[PDB]
């Protein structure tokens, strides 16, 4: 699993055209104030241990930033060892579930399988932009 | 070299605190309208062939999108095989130079060695978000 943690002042996205023949999640949009935006690329190795490692780290980092909202934002482009789409979708649902057992704030999982528009205003402070990798 | 190509409706950045002891580029800010924003992570293997491959591809993609502005945006977080900072800086300057010989539009190289704030509104069309890798 490859993640990018962006500490945003604001974030918004809108699904556009479907990127898969059958996106598993309905189309939509949302916007937010201060939030940790987590661009998430599910990799072939990812299983339950990986999800739990990622959930814990996300929770921990959010704690250090005093953020109260985490956006789980599916992203195909952070690595070149992607999981297949149905496995990736399952992992992301598991990650949302796991994160709720470790982080007390709002957890929003963006829809999976779509081309997206978005806007982010990303903070400039030293921890506002970090990358993570998790495996088992 | 690992790149992320974002077709933006708008982009702006501002350097914040220095991320290196001696950033090689002065602090600053800039904003743009429609532009291909190229998040660029220089890797250890990168040399002159890599720069020329990347310059050509960037030019080619920009051509297909009918963009007339390319932003070369230094980014430490797209891979886990980074070049050292002075090598990365040299490569990015070379890449800016190479790109100007292949792409007729505005080429802006963001300052190197800084924590950054930014905002981007990224387009939702199918080619608005792509990743690339170049080597020799
Ligand atoms: C494209 C860009 O604007 C948008 N944000 C996008 O990336 N959409 C992705 C994810 O929602 C999802 N997806 C497919 N495979 C994966 C994977 N392995 N990991 C995470 N997401 C995946 O399927 C879409 C197409 O690759
Ligand atoms: C941090 C985030 O907000 C900001 N955008 C940032 O990434 N700043 C980076 C790049 O400007 C640069 N840098 C250092 N090494 C590299 C490298 N190998 N490749 C590209 N840039 C590098 O040095 C800074 C600190 O890593
Ligand atoms: Mg809509
Ligand atoms: Mg300034």
From Swiss-Prot, chains A, B:
Which compartments does it reside in?
Cytoplasm
One Gene Ontology cellular component annotation?
cytoplasm
**Outcome of altering residue 115 to A?**
Whole protein and isolated domain have nearly wild-type deacylation of mischarged L-seryl-tRNA(Thr), no activity on L-threonyl-tRNA(Thr). Same results
Keyword Protein biosynthesis attached: yes
Molecular functions (GO terms): aminoacyl-tRNA deacylase activity; ATP binding; threonine-tRNA ligase activity; tRNA binding; zinc ion binding
* GO biological process assignments: threonyl-tRNA aminoacylation
Keyword entries, A-Z? Cytoplasm, Protein biosynthesis, RNA-binding, tRNA-binding
Domain of life according to the entry: Archaea
Major localisation? cytoplasm
Miscellaneous information on this protein: There are two ThrRS in this archaeon. The first one (APE_0809.1, AC Q9YDW0) is most similar to bacterial ThrRS but it lacks the N-terminal editing domain. The second one (APE_0117.1, this entry) is most similar to archaeal ThrRS but lacks the central catalytic domain; it probably does not aminoacylate tRNA(Thr).
The similarity comment for this entry is: Belongs to the class-II aminoacyl-tRNA synthetase family. Archaea-specific ThrRS editing domain subfamily.
Q: What does this protein do?
A: Freestanding tRNA editing subunit of threonine--tRNA ligase, the catalytic subunit is probably AC Q9YDW0. Deacylates (edits) mischarged L-seryl-tRNA(Thr) in trans; has no activity on correctly charged L-threonyl-tRNA(Thr). Probably does not aminoacylate tRNA(Thr). Deacylates correctly charged glycyl-tRNA(Gly), but not glycyl-tRNA(Gly)(2'-dA76) (the terminal 2'-OH of tRNA adenine 76 has been dehydroxylated) nor the 2'-fluoro tRNA derivative, strongly suggesting the editing function is catalyzed by the 2'-OH of A76 of tRNA(Thr).
According to the UniProt entry, the note on domains is: The N-terminal domain (about residues 1-140) is an archaea-specific tRNA-editing domain that has a highly similar structure to Dtd (D-aminoacyl-tRNA deacylase). Editing of incorrectly charged L-seryl-tRNA(Thr) by this domain is tRNA catalyzed.
Subunit organization: Probably interacts with its catalytic subunit.
Q: What is this protein called?
A: Threonine--tRNA ligase editing subunit
Traced from the root, the source organism's taxonomic lineage reads: Archaea, Thermoproteota, Thermoprotei, Desulfurococcales, Desulfurococcaceae
